[PDB]
């Protein structure tokens, strides 16, 4: 239940359709 | 004239993305995310073309928190290459000054089961009181937080979860303690 | 440059219709339809220029069924030329995979009374369990279903229903059994 | 109360304003 | 006790002797 | 003549590997794996020349499941560079059509202790009912499954486990519920 | 509480001041 941070590197594309 | 036409094309393309965000915008604190063409995007995550995907913004209310969801098809951190990683992101809202901080509403991450069994995989958690993910935002988005080992890749690829190469992700945020 | 300008005009016109649909979009399961310039459109229905009209999409919720209303000003089928026909249409929603099928929510078709009497004409019905109208959509829209003899043309044209050449149509869908 | 199908022929124009 | 999937990348050589 | 000689050399080499597999084949459901020259192969895993090693096939019986073992000397996933990873693999057997699915026999992964203490390190687990690793095989082998953090590299390299640069791996599969 | 080994790769600089 403990939140885990992310490993932000790159290559991010918002997708919604 | 050519320069203005190029500007118009950029503006028209930007507006097209603006329509879709408003079309799928939600204000009830529950986000349903549809990710089509899972096969080609999973391969892109493996090849590193696109490591993570960002969902459309969703809100607890008309003047609530601005939030979104982040997913890693190939996994992130310790779940890279073996699991699917789902992360919960706090974005800077226009009414953040009137909202209590740090963020403390219960957040439940769920993976919808498209089969008749409806055995949705979920993982609920309480926001960390002293993490940069749930503080008052200063930039566009805060640090993504979630479960890098949410669902195993093999478990996900055992049917009832990918129909028509599409997956459904449900995020539930409790709003019972928010005006 | 001329070809791009023509494309821009088409795209700009398409966006204008997109604004209106989102402006009048509803997510509470109740649709209020305003049809202005009834006199000229009724004549067009008689002349056959436009037999039926389609309402803007409306939803039971943020992630519910995608639905709309269809009306025949001059009537359809057995009510052609003597009555007004109102039909209820199920459209393909982006979240149809997570919704129960066949459609079974109670649907009530009502004609708003603009007069002080407020004597709204209505006709409630239960969706047919084995009709193509209430199945899981495969195309853009399913087969329209409703009451071809909903209201008589003479009864409609006896005042209190056409003010400023405008009619109001109310559709109520029960959402008490939907998550 | 029995639903009645339509008689789809053509000349359909969406109107909302 | 929960099984953990692998991270198949390559360079696999069967060894038995 | 030269072309046929080259084909003969390839066929002769292929047969040599075939002898060894049959020589070390087992049909009692228990696999003992001997990995000689551990020092040079551990360095190769660090250099990335050979990330993982595959054991010879072993079976629960004369007409049982076709199975093998996979090991990462330098670790895999979250145990990369700090632990030794051992994975259990289901292969496509010639009699898979007559065997129950999904795989559910208890699998115990053990590391033999070559010292006089005989303190074998082990980790037993139950196959996941809905993982691609234990389904009916469609390709040559399924997805490897096991414990990426089975044994720490430092713990392994504290003696009594590497004698004559050789390690012993024991896999025990319960066959008490198989005809 | 279980100790976890390291992943010694390189680029080590002692710092104390």
The Cα A1–Cα B128 span in angstroms is 10
3-class DSSP state of B66: strand
Beta strands in A1-17 (DSSP E): 4-5, 12-14
Q: Which residues, in sequence order, are bridge partners of residue A10?
A: none
Name residue, tokens 């995979």. Answer: C97
Contact C90, C137 (CB under 8 A): yes
Subunit partners of chain G (3 or more CB pairs within 8 A):
F
Identity of the residue in F78, F131, F135 whose CB atom sits nearest the CB atom of B152: F131
Torsion of CA F147, F151, F154, F157, to 10 degrees: -120
Identity of the residue in B8, B26, B112 whose CB atom sits nearest the CB atom of C98: B112
Q: Name the phi and psi angles at B58, rounded to 5.
A: -135, 155
Count CB atoms within 10 A of the CB of residue C118. 9
Run of H or E including F18: helix F2-23
Q: Name the phi and psi angles at C4, rounded to 5.
A: -65, -35
Identity of the residue in B34, B35, B145 whose CB atom sits nearest the CB atom of A3: B145
Number of cross-chain residue pairs from E and F with Cβ atoms under 8 Å apart = 69
Contact C36, C42 (CB under 8 A): no
Q: How many residues does chain D have?
A: 17
The Cα F70–Cα F86 span in angstroms is 6
- Contact at CB, B80 and E7, closer than 8 angstroms: yes
The Cα B46–Cα C133 span in angstroms is 42
What are the residues whose beta carbons fall under 8 Å from the beta carbon of C2, sequence distance 6 or more?
none
Contact C105, C127 (CB under 8 A): yes
3-class DSSP state of B58: strand
For F133, nearest residue in chain E (alpha carbons): E5
Phi-psi region of B57 (alpha: psi -120 to 50; beta: other; left: phi over 0): beta
Q: What is the DSSP letter of F19?
A: H
| H-assigned helices in chain B | 2-23, 38-47, 153-156
Name residue, tokens 């939030």. Answer: B67
Proportion of chain C in helix, strand, coil states, percent, rounded to 5: 25, 30, 45
Name residue, tokens 């890279």. Answer: B80
Count CB atoms within 10 A of the CB of residue C54. 20
Beta strands in chain F (DSSP E): 30-36, 52-54, 58-59, 66-72, 83-91, 107-111, 121-125, 145-152, 166-173
List Cα–Cα distances, B114 to B121, C163, C172, in angstroms.
Answer: 11, 48, 28
Contact B26, C62 (CB under 8 A): yes
Name residue, tokens 């590497």. Answer: F162
The Cα B35–Cα B167 span in angstroms is 5
Run of H or E including C152: strand C145-152
Q: Residue C127's closest CA among C150, C149, C108?
A: C108
The Cα F55–Cα E17 span in angstroms is 10
Q: What is the DSSP letter of F26?
A: B
Q: Name the phi and psi angles at F96, rounded to 5.
A: -65, -25
Count CB atoms within 10 A of the CB of residue C52. 23
Tokens encoding C134: 């209430």
Residue B81 contacts E, CB cutoff 8 Å: yes
The Cα B175–Cα C87 span in angstroms is 38
The Cα F36–Cα F165 span in angstroms is 6
Q: Which residues, in sequence order, are bridge partners of residue C83?
A: C152
- Contact at CB, B34 and C94, closer than 8 angstroms: yes
Can you give the resolution of this entry in Å? 2.8
What are the residues whose beta carbons fall under 8 Å from the beta carbon of C143, sequence distance 6 or more?
C131, C132, C133, D5, D6, D8
The Cα B73–Cα B80 span in angstroms is 9
The Cα F152–Cα F163 span in angstroms is 18
Subunit partners of chain B (3 or more CB pairs within 8 A):
A, C, E, F
Radius of gyration of chain F (CA): 18
The Cα C167–Cα C157 span in angstroms is 11
Count CB atoms within 10 A of the CB of residue F18. 10
Identity of the residue in F50, F56, F147 whose CB atom sits nearest the CB atom of E16: F56
3-class DSSP state of C12: helix
Tokens encoding C81: 């030329």
Q: Residue E6's closest CA among F128, C164, B177, F147?
A: F147
Q: Is the peptide bond before G17 cis (omega within 30 degrees of 0)?
A: no
Phi-psi region of C139 (alpha: psi -120 to 50; beta: other; left: phi over 0): beta
The Cα B106–Cα B124 span in angstroms is 8
- Contact at CB, E4 and F146, closer than 8 angstroms: yes
Q: Residue F42's closest CA among F52, F33, F34?
A: F52
**D with C: touching (≥3 Cβ pairs within 8 Å):** yes
List Cα–Cα distances, B170 to B36, B71, B91, B122, B176, in angstroms.
Answer: 15, 12, 18, 9, 18
The Cα B113–Cα B70 span in angstroms is 19
| Structure determined via | cryo-EM
The Cα F52–Cα F72 span in angstroms is 5
Tokens encoding F63: 């007409």
């Amino acid at each position: 239940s403990v939140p885990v941070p992310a490993t932000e590197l790159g290559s991010t594309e918002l997708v919604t359709t | 004239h050519d320069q203005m036409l190029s500007v118009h094309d950029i503006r028209l393309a930007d507006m097209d993305l603006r329509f879709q965000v408003l079309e799928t915008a939600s204000y009830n604190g529950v986000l349903i995310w549809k990710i089509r063409d899972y096969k080609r995007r999973k391969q892109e995550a493996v090849m590193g073309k696109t490591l993570s995907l960002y969902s459309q913004p969703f809100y607890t209310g008309y003047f609530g928190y601005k939030m979104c969801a982040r997913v890693y098809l190939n996994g992130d951190g310790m779940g890279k290459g073996t699991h699917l990683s789902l992360f919960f992101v706090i974005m800077r809202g226009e009414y953040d000054a009137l909202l209590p901080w740090p963020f403390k509403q219960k957040v439940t991450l769920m993976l919808m089961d498209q089969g008749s069994s409806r055995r949705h995989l979920g993982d609920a958690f309480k926001p960390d009181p002293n993490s940069s993910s749930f503080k008052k935002p200063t930039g566009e988005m805060n640090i993504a937080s979630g479960c890098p080992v949410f669902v195993a890749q093999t478990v996900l690829e055992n049917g009832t979860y990918i129909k028509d190469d599409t997956i459904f992700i449900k995020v539930i945020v409790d709003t019972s303690d928010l005006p």
